[PDB]
From a paper:
We have demonstrated the pipeline on five different proteins (IMPDH, HEX-1, Cathepsin B, Luciferase and EGFP-µNS), representing a selection of soluble proteins of different source organisms that crystallize in insect cells in their native compartment or, in case of peroxisomes, readily in the cytoplasm or nucleus of the cells. Importantly, as shown for IMPDH and HEX-1, InCellCryst can produce crystals from native protein sequences, without purification tags or even remnants of proteolytically removed tags, within a quasi-native cellular environment. The rich source of biomolecules in the cellular environment allows the identification of native ligands by co-crystallization at quasi physiological conditions, representing a unique feature of InCellCryst.
All IMPDH structures show natural ligands at the canonical binding sites 1 and 2 in the Bateman domain. However, instead of guanosine monophosphate (GMP) found in the IMPDH N-His structure solved from isolated crystals, the structures solved in this study allow a clear identification of GDP in the canonical binding site 2, stabilized by hydrogen bonds to Lys133 and Arg101 that coordinate the α-phosphate and β-phosphate of GDP. In addition, a phosphate is bound to the IMP binding site of the catalytic domain of the IMPDH structures. As observed in the previously published IMPDH structure solved by SFX20, the canonical binding site 1 incorporates an ATP molecule. However, we observed two conformations of the bound ATP, where the gamma phosphates of the adjacent ATP molecules are either opposing or facing each other. The base and ribose are stabilized by interactions with Thr180, Thr174 or Asp158 and His200, whereas the different phosphate groups are interacting mainly with Thr156, Lys157, Arg219, Gly201, solvent molecules and the main chain. As shown here, serial synchrotron diffraction data can be processed by using CrystFEL and XDS. However, the identification of crystal wedges is a prerequisite for processing with XDS, which is mainly used for single crystal rotational datasets. Based on these results, in cellulo diffraction data collection clearly improves the bioinformation on natively bound ligands and their conformation compared to the diffraction of isolated in cellulo or conventionally grown crystals.
Numbering used by the authors:
A (entry chain A): 2 to 322, 331 to 401, 440 to 494
B (entry chain B): 2 to 320, 331 to 404, 440 to 493
C (entry chain B): 309 to 320, 331 to 404
D (entry chain A): 2 to 103
E (entry chain A): 440 to 494
Write the structure that this text describes.
Amino acid sequence: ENTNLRTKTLRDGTTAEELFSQDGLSFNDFIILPGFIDFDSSKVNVSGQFTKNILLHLPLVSSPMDTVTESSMARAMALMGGIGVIHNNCTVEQQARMVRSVKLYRNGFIMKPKSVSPDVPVSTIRNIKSEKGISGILVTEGGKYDGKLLGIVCTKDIDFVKDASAPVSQYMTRRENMTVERYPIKLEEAMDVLNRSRHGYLPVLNDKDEVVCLCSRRDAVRARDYPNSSLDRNGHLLCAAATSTREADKGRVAALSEAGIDVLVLDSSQGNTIYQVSFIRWVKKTYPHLEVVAGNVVTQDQAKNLIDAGADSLRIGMGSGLACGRPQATAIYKVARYAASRGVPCVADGGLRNVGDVCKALAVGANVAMLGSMIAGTSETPGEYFFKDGMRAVLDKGSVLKLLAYIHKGLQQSAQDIGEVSFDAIREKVYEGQVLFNRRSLTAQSE
Amino acid sequence: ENTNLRTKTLRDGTTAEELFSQDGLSFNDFIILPGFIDFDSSKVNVSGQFTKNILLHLPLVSSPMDTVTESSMARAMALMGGIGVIHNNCTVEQQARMVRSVKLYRNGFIMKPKSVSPDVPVSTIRNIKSEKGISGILVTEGGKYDGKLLGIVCTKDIDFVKDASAPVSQYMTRRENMTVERYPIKLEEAMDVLNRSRHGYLPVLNDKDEVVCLCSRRDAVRARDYPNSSLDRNGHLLCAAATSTREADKGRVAALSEAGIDVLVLDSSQGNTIYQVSFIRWVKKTYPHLEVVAGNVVTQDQAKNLIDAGADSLRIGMGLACGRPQATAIYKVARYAASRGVPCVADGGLRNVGDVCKALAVGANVAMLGSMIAGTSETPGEYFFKDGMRLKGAVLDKGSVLKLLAYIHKGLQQSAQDIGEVSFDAIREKVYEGQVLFNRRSLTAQS
Amino acid sequence: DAGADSLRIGMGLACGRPQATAIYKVARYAASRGVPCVADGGLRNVGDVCKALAVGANVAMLGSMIAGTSETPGEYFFKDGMRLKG
Amino acid sequence: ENTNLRTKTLRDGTTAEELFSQDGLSFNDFIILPGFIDFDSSKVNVSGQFTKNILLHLPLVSSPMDTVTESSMARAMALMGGIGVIHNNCTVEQQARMVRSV
Amino acid sequence: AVLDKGSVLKLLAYIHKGLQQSAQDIGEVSFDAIREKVYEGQVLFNRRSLTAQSE
Ligand SMILES: Nc1ncnc2c1ncn2[C@@H]1O[C@H](COP(=O)(O)OP(=O)(O)OP(=O)(O)O)[C@@H](O)[C@H]1O
Ligand SMILES: Nc1ncnc2c1ncn2[C@@H]1O[C@H](COP(=O)(O)OP(=O)(O)OP(=O)(O)O)[C@@H](O)[C@H]1O
Ligand SMILES: Nc1nc2c(ncn2[C@@H]2O[C@H](COP(=O)(O)OP(=O)(O)O)[C@@H](O)[C@H]2O)c(=O)[nH]1
Ligand SMILES: Nc1nc2c(ncn2[C@@H]2O[C@H](COP(=O)(O)OP(=O)(O)O)[C@@H](O)[C@H]2O)c(=O)[nH]1
């Protein structure tokens, strides 16, 4: 099961360079020829580079459209090993709030735990639960998360109360009878003593009995259930956001960075503009820690200009999902190849209708694929559910989590047939002529 | 009181008796005319009699088909105020097991609580919660539901355990440190102490510290979340099972009675048989506490024999060269049955809300949903992605039946409001009295 | 009886009535009490309008026959070789 | 926003000469690849030469068909920056009258 | 017979804005410029397979 049985010498097939050396191709114009299998598909590494410094376990990105990606969608994507791009069809404050909802969902130490005054009614606690999905409210002097811990409120503390106008001080669990930990605590010790606690929450108090931070058992369980979540150096879910390149958007970017985005995705049908070029340089000079994915491109000429400005990644697509544009398969292969030579990953955006098209798009050179329409009916989308004849406009596809798992197994099985245990491996063998294709006549496509 | 405004003296309309005096009709042949409104649609009682002694808050019954009603579906129906009929395309024991799932899911005093011996591994508890969905396992001498109480195992006692082979006694919470109660106590007081303790479970022990029964906080919340659940005299969800009427099926009926069915439903294409007459008589003689829904009938002649044999209820519907248009059959059979104090179940042909409304209006007390429920997640089957679609097998995915049932409830109320009566019981009576009036539609008057 | 000077006839769920019958019945009753009626809905061509007036309606209400005209609210656009309002 | 950012050196694309060097093409057989933008579309000069000595602000001409171009159509076209061709499915005097009307 | 398209004036304005937006994407501020750059190889095209046209 070694190199001798895997390396093609006969090379009966067509290389990508030959395949894309003529008229522009759709994904249905070609097919990938099988290779040599010595491994179960469960072992296939599907990972791709979203940007220079960000590797995604699942090479899947949710589109920045107001019908697809908001907080809930972005959370789901990061949980499964990919990432979401919060859309920019909202006010600056609204988009920043969505980013915080994603960033602050998972964390190890909760730095600004949600706190209330002892006088607030149970109704506001229940509202916090239904809207923000946060239990374990800390009751503190003044309501400021800054300390003076008086008690905590959990679901079993309010579920039986009939007068929602009652102060939480009546029903909360009071500090006198609470298990807490003092300031110099390491996270691993803190989580261990919490699990021993058999409680959901462990406040960390300073010597004045003030709240420095909070530990949540829900975060422990989330790690166990989603071991491949896309996380940053601080244990938060990764979150991208989209903006245009106009001058007014600079304020929007600043608020987005202050809210914790890890990647900035530029919004333009064609991104090869003096405006996008300036914007990238300004983002790089002002927010170096931020990574920029540059506007939509279809030609190496466009890709050169945006890469020169400092773009950490490129979004590929035009006329894919007007006499100006380019067929997606060709556009991906050409741009992704040029960008690879400059060490820049690429995102396939548009034309990805099924699992097979996503496989081809990665094999031909895209590091990660952007899902717009494949995700349209899932329950993490911003829309609302209604019954015309069946649902709960588009069709209800269920939970995006189950769909992402289905795509993941799809990619793994396609990689197994192609004969490589890695999509990094597939992309390299495609450039080398060891992964071969076959253009299909139109008749061959009908059958 | 607005009797002058609501009672029709002009009577511009067709009475149900005139409408059904000609060729057989389906629900699209006629429309219900508007009445008089002086109430919000929220205040409409849609309840109907499933059988002589069973009133359903929601007049909906899930069909006894292997693709519709098993334990989960029957739970969902009962919780929403309807009921479900476990299908009989299974073995006796499998059907009995499903009945038990429904009956013992919601209940006040848990009588044979799932207990364990101290030597059992953490693995089995995870299995208990996974396969059966129960998280209050009691640790007892000999692992017998009636043995000395030694501890409880709940979710947070197992969150963190890496060697699942470990004994459950290592991580349980010892009886030494549990808040419990002594045998002679009342359910009202037991739930009050349970709510005050902030725990999920409260065991009731005898004077030898042997377990007598168990109180679950989940049943308390299920009561709040589903205040209209179809309950029996002991706080369990109502459940119904189907059977055939041949001699072999007497063993099945004995099994279902022991498993706790509240309604026996006879399954037949045509129920006007010597075999069903004898079966009904036998069920009523040997199992007096069982109500019976008699086989599918389409005519009063058939209804007379099954009612005369002792049926508590009738299933209306048939459709070969033998059958009858569904709207006529419901009206005729229900009208005859009503004069003898027997409710009727509209079975089949109920594709939208309007049909359900019309079926209730024309005499049916309760409607049987087969296809409207076919895609919901509480039906048996597995989900798959065929072509950009989530399907169960096939049919399209309709989401949760709970949300659908609420939709139908709101629909029934709204159409009741137009008709001008605060009750479907009123609508049935006013139809028979000629105060609710219809219009036959010409064919060209379709839309 | 409450004081209406005129009535809108038309409805159409499981509740409503065929439009031609409703206009005739309601208009005939209303006429005996000296009240005119407005045929509302289901008037797609001239013949329907004619029939509705003939059967008792004094006046017809045009919804869809007027939908595209330039005096309606909305802006014009060119979708596919067509001028549309939305 | 100068020549360095606009001139293609990589030349990733197909020239018109290559594109039309084979079987005959309809307009749907090809697509124009994008370039480099440093200006609002409001500034785009769409003008074309109708003839050697006639430059049209709008490069649009109405067909000389009896169902398309008479006086009114020809007037509208010239107003918007283009031109109309009065059709010849009429008597000489009738067509001349239409021209005078324009 | 055909459908009423309204005033040719509004249609000519729509085409005018269409051409201006297509020229912007192509990257030239003039159609005289586009035609010359096409002859020079600085405006490039891409033939589309039949499948690529269906999508
Ligand atoms: N650090 C603590 N010390 C003492 N008691 C605590 C502590 N944290 C939580 N409690 C309380 O212990 C009891 C058990 O926890 P809890 O109600 O959270 O279970 P739960 O159903 O999972 O609710 P939640 O959604 O908040 O986790 C509650 O009354 C809670 O207020
Ligand atoms: N009667 C009791 N006395 C003492 N401890 C108890 C009692 N009942 C449960 N506990 C323990 O309280 C702790 C918290 O209970 P827990 O929240 O895990 O119950 P639960 O019903 O499974 O709620 P949930 O699943 O929503 O978190 C656990 O260690 C549990 O073993
Ligand atoms: N007490 C508590 N706080 C949490 C928990 N999880 C997250 N938080 C924090 O609680 C805050 C809730 O959001 P918030 O600041 O009120 O949103 P805003 O009002 O729109 O600015 C955030 O700072 C979260 O980080 C939890 O489980 N318990
Ligand atoms: N510990 C515990 N037992 C429950 C609960 N709800 C129901 N039960 C009981 O647990 C049992 C269900 O499992 P069981 O019938 O023993 O499975 P079987 O061995 O296949 O018959 C029944 O005795 C129920 O009454 C709960 O919440 N906690």
